[PDB]
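Pentaerythritol tetranitrate reductase
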Amino acid sequence: AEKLFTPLKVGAVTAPNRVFMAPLTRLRSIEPGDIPTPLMGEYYRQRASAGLIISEATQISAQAKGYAGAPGLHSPEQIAAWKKITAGVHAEDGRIAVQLWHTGRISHSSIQPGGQAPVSASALNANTRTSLRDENGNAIRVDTTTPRALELDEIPGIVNDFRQAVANAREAGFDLVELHSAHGYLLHQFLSPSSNQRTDQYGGSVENRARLVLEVVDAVCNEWSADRIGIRVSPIGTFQNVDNGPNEEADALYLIEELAKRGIAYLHMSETDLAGGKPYSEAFRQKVRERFHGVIIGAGAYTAEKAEDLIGKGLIDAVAFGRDYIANPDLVARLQKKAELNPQRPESFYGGGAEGYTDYPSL
Ligand SMILES: Cc1cc2nc3c(=O)[nH]c(=O)nc-3n(C[C@H](O)[C@H](O)[C@H](O)COP(=O)(O)O)c2cc1C
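Tokens:
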């Protein structure tokens, strides 16, 4: 097929194809310590023919943690383990970005430092569930704990934690960093009027709601380089953990314009929740494309045909596939050859071990 398999310059690195591996939480890290494993290194290595791998969401700090089994990038042991994973990808001539998150109110007190309430823009429960582990280490669901609103004087420490995690990612050998500003996590909790009822300079107006994410962007650009920074947004639609308010399109375009001023490597748009949503209109895609001067990655139930169509139209540059990458380590070769895909086994997307993780065969 015609443009999916051609190179693309993505900030400081060049992808040999446009078939990207979306960030995918798999909840297989070691506890205690939230440490990446050899098995996770093998999983990533198997996928290194991707144009770019974007890692599972990774904590910037202990406080960022909201899921048992999700890895961090804040401790020495975590840095050491990730260095190995990046070295494995590089040994197979791949490229890998770390997605960095703070889960905010999508968390539980039992996995917070001190066992205390998690933090958010406002003290409003997400009214959803997260994943913990039981006494045998198996993934279980638990209702989210009501959070504590961050005090104004705590906000600089959040920005610093993102900055430090990006410094640690560089040390760890990642090619790029993806800020997780999507899916109702901390940055999005500030962005959304649904989850942010603050009356300080971090709530109310769109400019106030985007203030935190833009401070984080600035801090990480300064720490490393703008051509090493990507951002994931999900600014249109209703996600499990939050909606985008009553002026979603205008607010999205405001944010995107701001992000472009920073000259960052990429804009990754998660277009719908797993549960579905209204498709992006081509008019809205044009409006995004004229505001952002870097690479645009599209995601959300894409097929190869839709990817080619929108790439051919000059509307996006690359596609991130999530579940097809879970099941097909050599998704690039399969798409290039129009080969059949392995069937997905959703029961093993979260937790467990090798089964449903490293046992999906290549051609
Ligand atoms: C098991 C699983 C875990 C995911 N984990 C994350 C994540 O860590 N970060 C994130 O931004 N999105 C995550 N997503 C969303 C995916 O990155 C992707 O946007 C989504 O699966 C839709 O694309 P698909 O139809 O190609 O699977 C996850 C999706 C699934 C199914």
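Residues 1-363 form a domain with the TIM Barrel fold (CATH 3.20.20.70).
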